[PDB]
Amino acid sequence: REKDYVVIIGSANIDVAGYSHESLNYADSNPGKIKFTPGGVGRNIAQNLALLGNKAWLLSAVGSDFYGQSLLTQTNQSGVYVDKCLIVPGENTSSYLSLLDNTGEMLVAINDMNISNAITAEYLAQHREFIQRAKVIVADCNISEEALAWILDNAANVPVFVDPVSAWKCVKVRDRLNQIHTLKPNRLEAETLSGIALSGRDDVAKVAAWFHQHGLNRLVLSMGGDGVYYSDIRGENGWSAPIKTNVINVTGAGDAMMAGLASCWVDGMPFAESVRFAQGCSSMALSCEYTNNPDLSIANVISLVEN
Amino acid sequence: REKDYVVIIGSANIDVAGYSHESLNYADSNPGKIKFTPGGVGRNIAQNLALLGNKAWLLSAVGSDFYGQSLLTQTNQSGVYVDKCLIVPGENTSSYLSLLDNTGEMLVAINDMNISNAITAEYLAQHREFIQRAKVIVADCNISEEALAWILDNAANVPVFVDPVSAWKCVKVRDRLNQIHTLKPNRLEAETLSGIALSGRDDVAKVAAWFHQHGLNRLVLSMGGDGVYYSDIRGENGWSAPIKTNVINVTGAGDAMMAGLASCWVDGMPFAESVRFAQGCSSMALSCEYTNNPDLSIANVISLVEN
Numbered sequence: 001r002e003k004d005y006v007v008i009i010g011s012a013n014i015d016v017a018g019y020s021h022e023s024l025n026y027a028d029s030n031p032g033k034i035k036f037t038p039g040g041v042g043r044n045i046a047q048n049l050a051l052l053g054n055k056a057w058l059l060s061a062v063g064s065d066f067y068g069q070s071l072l073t074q075t076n077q078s079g080v081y082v083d084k085c086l087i088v089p090g091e092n093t094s095s096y097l098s099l100l101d102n103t104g105e106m107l108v109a110i111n112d113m114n115i116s117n118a119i120t121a122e123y124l125a126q127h128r129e130f131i132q133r134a135k136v137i138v139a140d141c142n143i144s145e146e147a148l149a150w151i152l153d154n155a156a157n158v159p160v161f162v163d164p165v166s167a168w169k170c171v172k173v174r175d176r177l178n179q180i181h182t183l184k185p186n187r188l189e190a191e192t193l194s195g196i197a198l199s200g201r202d203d204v205a206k207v208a209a210w211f212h213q214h215g216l217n218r219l220v221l222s223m224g225g226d227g228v229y230y231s232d233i234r235g236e237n238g239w240s241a242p243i244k245t246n247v248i249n250v251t252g253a254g255d256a257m258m259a260g261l262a263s264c265w266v267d268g269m270p271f272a273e274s275v276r277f278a279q280g281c282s283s284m285a286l287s288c289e290y291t292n293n294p295d296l297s298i299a300n301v302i303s304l305v306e307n
Numbered sequence: 308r309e310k311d312y313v314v315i316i317g318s319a320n321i322d323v324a325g326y327s328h329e330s331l332n333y334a335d336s337n338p339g340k341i342k343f344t345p346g347g348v349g350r351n352i353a354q355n356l357a358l359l360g361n362k363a364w365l366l367s368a369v370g371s372d373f374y375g376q377s378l379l380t381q382t383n384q385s386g387v388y389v390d391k392c393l394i395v396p397g398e399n400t401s402s403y404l405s406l407l408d409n410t411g412e413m414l415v416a417i418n419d420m421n422i423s424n425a426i427t428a429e430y431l432a433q434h435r436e437f438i439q440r441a442k443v444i445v446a447d448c449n450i451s452e453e454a455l456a457w458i459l460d461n462a463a464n465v466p467v468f469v470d471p472v473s474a475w476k477c478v479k480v481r482d483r484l485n486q487i488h489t490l491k492p493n494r495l496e497a498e499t500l501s502g503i504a505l506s507g508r509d510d511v512a513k514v515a516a517w518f519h520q521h522g523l524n525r526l527v528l529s530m531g532g533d534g535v536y537y538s539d540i541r542g543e544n545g546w547s548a549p550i551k552t553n554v555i556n557v558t559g560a561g562d563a564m565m566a567g568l569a570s571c572w573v574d575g576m577p578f579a580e581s582v583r584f585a586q587g588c589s590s591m592a593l594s595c596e597y598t599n600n601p602d603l604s605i606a607n608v609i610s611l612v613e614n
């Protein structure tokens with residue numbers, strides 16, 4: 001519907017990936033390749049929602065530094081509405097810098113994301129009515145605990161989908177599971193939140209039971225080669241095997257996952273079929289060089305899934 | 308004079324400096340600080356010329372990638388005329404990525420500068436008449452040998468000041484010294500060009516004699532703690548001691564040097580006094596965090612020099 005839109009609250013980064021063509025020198029500047037790409041979990045999810053055909057508004061923060069403007073401009077080009085993003089007077093725009101291998105393997109990564117703290121409850125409250133009229137809200141855990149609490153306290157019965165981002169950053173959701181419609185942790189995040197070891201497939205039922213006892217509506221638990229375990233507090237649960245994928249670069253798979261889950265909810269799709277769809281979204285991120293595959297589309301995901 | 312302008316032909320980079328706050332992990336992404344800054348020897352010199360009060364036009368190349376646009380936009384903000392810069396359809400904009408230490412020390416550097424080869428003789432010839440009406444031309448040795456040869460062959464009696472950039476890239480000037488008005492090598496560059504060891508102060512006279520025998524008009528030879536040796540083919544030569552400087556970050560000192568030399572030539576200043584002025588330009592770059600000190604100005608350099 002032409003007035004239906006989705007609101008994403010999370011980080012917008014410039015990802016910088018550099019690798020040397022040959023063996024590193026340290027004692028010299030080495031000819032290599034350097035790529036600047038848009039990143040940040042929330043920004044990536046928003047771009048994926050746009051590619052999936054939703055009107056997606058990003059609520060985020062960048063500095064005033066020209067490169068922050070390029071970030072916002074490029075994310076607009078892919079379909080995202082960036083007009084409510086906060087510009088932070090004279091601040092570095094967040095970035096995530098990785099040194100990769102001559103063969104594409106990670107070495108060391110620096111992340112500089114303090115301006116995520118500029119995504120305050122005060123900022124979000126300036127868009128209260130807009131947020132409260134979205135079809136769904138996606139929040140990432142890069143934002144502060146106070147900002148996440150504000151979203152969950154003021155969602156006004158709009159479902160909030162939460163991306164835990166990392167084992168470090170996920171813990172702010174632990175006491176607010178009863179306010180979250182859908183949570184999408186990996187194995188380490190679910191172990192970290194629950195305090196229960198996930199040693200194998202046999203352990204997911206007791207971990208899911210812990211999440212539901214603490215009030216979580218829906219769990220979408222990614223278990224790597226084991227596939228995805230999904231669980232609804234009303235009783236439905238199940239496993240979905242992974243989709244055989246030729247993996248090109250792993251970055252952005254979970255951001256595509258989350259977009260697929262939220263897009264399918266907005267489109268009226270049932271839970272289990274939404275999890276399988278989102279697995280196909282992630283598969284298209286996995287088979288692409290960039291962290292957002294610009295061939296992400298409803299049509300392209302369905303064809304992948306039918307295989 | 309309101310129609311006097313200077314033309315700079317060289318590289319425009321995004322410099323990316325990242326350091327971890329603490330000891331590196333490799334096995335993790337480390338919280339740290341990441342800074343994006345305009346760079347590239349030719350772009351830096353142009354910005355310094357603008358700060359020194361000259362109308363400076365940059366002839367350079369960036370890709371179409373939003374971040375290339377931010378580069379050009381920011382360089383305009385400091386006074387540089389960027390309207391003739393070549394945009395390269397769908398190309399990475401050049402970058403220079405350094406991993407710095409928790410204490411500011413260099414570790415490893417990647418440079419990605421192949422689009423410097425887009426600064427072709429064909430491109431430059433589209434601005435032949437404009438180039439041939441500049442008061443002075445500054446070229447860096449990031450550009451190809453064919454492009455440098457084009458500039459030196461078509462300068463039409465406009466003086467060409469050449470920045471050798473590095474020991475690797477300087478060698479393209481060796482056979483064209485008789486076409487260069489002023490060359491500004493450091494000790495390793497002058498050793499590399501001449502084939503003569505510069506073991507100490509006692510060796511500069513024979514190295515300068517080699518440059519003049521091969522047709523170089525003016526040599527400005529930086530010898531580190533020994534200061535600067537200058538030499539004119541017509542017979543004047545001398546040493547200028549370094550200016551005591553509280554060094555904050557070494558990047559951009561030579562770019563300020565070159566700007567001071569070319570600015571002083573355009574302003575009518577004699578050779579020896581122009582070398583001492585340019586030493587003060589470099590001193591202000593050295594005492595600044597960024598690779599271009601935005602307090603660079605004629606007034607601020609003179610006051611530094613009188614001390």
Ligand SMILES: Cn1cc([C@@H]2O[C@H](CO)[C@@H](O)[C@H]2O)c(=O)[nH]c1=O
Binds near residue numbers: 041
């Ligand atoms: C270490 N890190 C990384 C990110 C981003 O994740 C995306 C891939 O999903 C990349 O584009 C990064 O910019 C983040 O948002 N928060 C965080 O802590």
Ligand SMILES: Cn1cc([C@@H]2O[C@H](CO)[C@@H](O)[C@H]2O)c(=O)[nH]c1=O
Binds near residue numbers: 321348449
């Ligand atoms: C390794 N390297 C570095 C540069 C630039 O030098 C400036 C400082 O003077 C920095 O801004 C770099 O971007 C260059 O132009 N050509 C080259 O080969």
Ligand SMILES: [K+]
Binds near residue numbers: 252292
């Ligand atoms: K990818």
Ligand SMILES: [K+]
Binds near residue numbers: 560593595598
């Ligand atoms: K500096």
